[model samples]
Target: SMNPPPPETSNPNKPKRQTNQLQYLLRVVLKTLWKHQFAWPFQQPVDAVKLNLPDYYKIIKTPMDMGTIKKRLENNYYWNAQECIQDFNTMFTNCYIYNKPGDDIVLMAEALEKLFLQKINELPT
Candidate 1:
């Protein structure tokens, strides 16, 4: 019998979250996520703003370490959650190893939402 702590739930009667506050919070997460994404391929001195598919591939490959970018892409972010372990493993590795700037934390939240949009089909019923 091992019951974990219950999740903290919000009440409907509680005060509504302010739009500005929510936006600010989301921005922070988005920026942080974006920074990690950017850092994945920044061991050189190229113009980050002008990065292309080739550049993206280079960084994506680093995490794989000659593993298989194309194959990994085809697995986790490709479509199915069948291999959640590997998919999440790669993501965790990136977040831990690759970091971001303080200011970028804001935008990372937004970017994360957008990335999920393309990947996740929908919320559970």
Candidate 2:
């Protein structure tokens, strides 16, 4: 385990940067977002049972979270940037729907989304 093996499963002419489009950017951006103060609320899946917000399930159909996105990213789940962007949209949109306007969580989502947008702009091609 020279480097404990790279995250990507290397094979036949497959290089990390070229073979994996936006993979590096994905990781760096996620790391940046993960460290943000407002990242806590969107970091994990909401436990409707634990939080006692049973009606949370009634409205929010697809609960997107940073934790889930990180897993999908590691699994190489996205085929294109569109899919990746849509996940962020889903996460933010869900926050908009679940939480009322002017709430701190809603504002947190906005702030995180802003940070994500700024970072993603740095992605080369």
Candidate 3:
């Protein structure tokens, strides 16, 4: 018999062998960001400069509001696969403090990647 994958961290309500939806979402985001060498809490200032993008610095310095993101996700705001992308675009695009003019693309990309993976988990196994 083959061994099963390990359970997600810190949630006792869920089965030990089961993964959390957030874990799945986060993993998807990390995988995509890694391709651009922009994984959270790991991407460097030099990498930001090399990319010729100001948003990377902003993302590293600012704290993302994951609670709001999750709430928007549950609401299914745009009511389509693009909902997360739309919401993220609206947020980073309009925010004048934490996010800058160029932040929308990278921020929305990461958020949408998470949303896409969440959608995948919702599909029939």
The whole-model C-alpha lDDT of candidate 3 against the native structure comes to: 0.40
Per-residue lDDT of 16-111 in model 1, one digit per residue for the tens? 332432332234432333355643332222233454323433354324211232233222222233333243345434433444544463355335
lDDT of 3 at 88: 37
Sorted by lDDT (best first), the order is: 2, 3, 1
Per-model TM-score on C-alpha atoms: 0.26, 0.80, 0.27
Better of 2 and 3 by lDDT: 2
Q: Per-residue lDDT for 1-125 in model 2, tens only?
A: 01112122223443222224447546788878999989998777777766778787778777777877777677666566656677788999999999999999999999998888887777766
RMSD versus native structure for model 3:
13.0
C-alpha lDDT (0 to 100) for residue 48 of candidate 1: 30
- Write down the worst ten-residue block by lDDT for model 3: 1-10
Enumerate residue pairs that collide in model 2: none
| Cα lDDT, model 2, residue 11 | 38
The RMSD (Cα, Å) of candidate 1 is: 17.6
Quality of model 1 by C-alpha lDDT:
0.35
Candidate 3: tens digits of C-alpha lDDT, residues 1-125:
22222211234453323234334333554244445432332222124444565564444343233344444334332234343344334433333443444675456545545654565556332
Q: Pairing residues by index, what is the TM-score of model 2? A: 0.80
Task: Look at candidate 2 and tell me the lDDT of residue 104.
Answer: 90
Q: What residue runs in model 3 are displaced by over 4 Å at the alpha carbon? A: 1-66, 75-78, 96-125
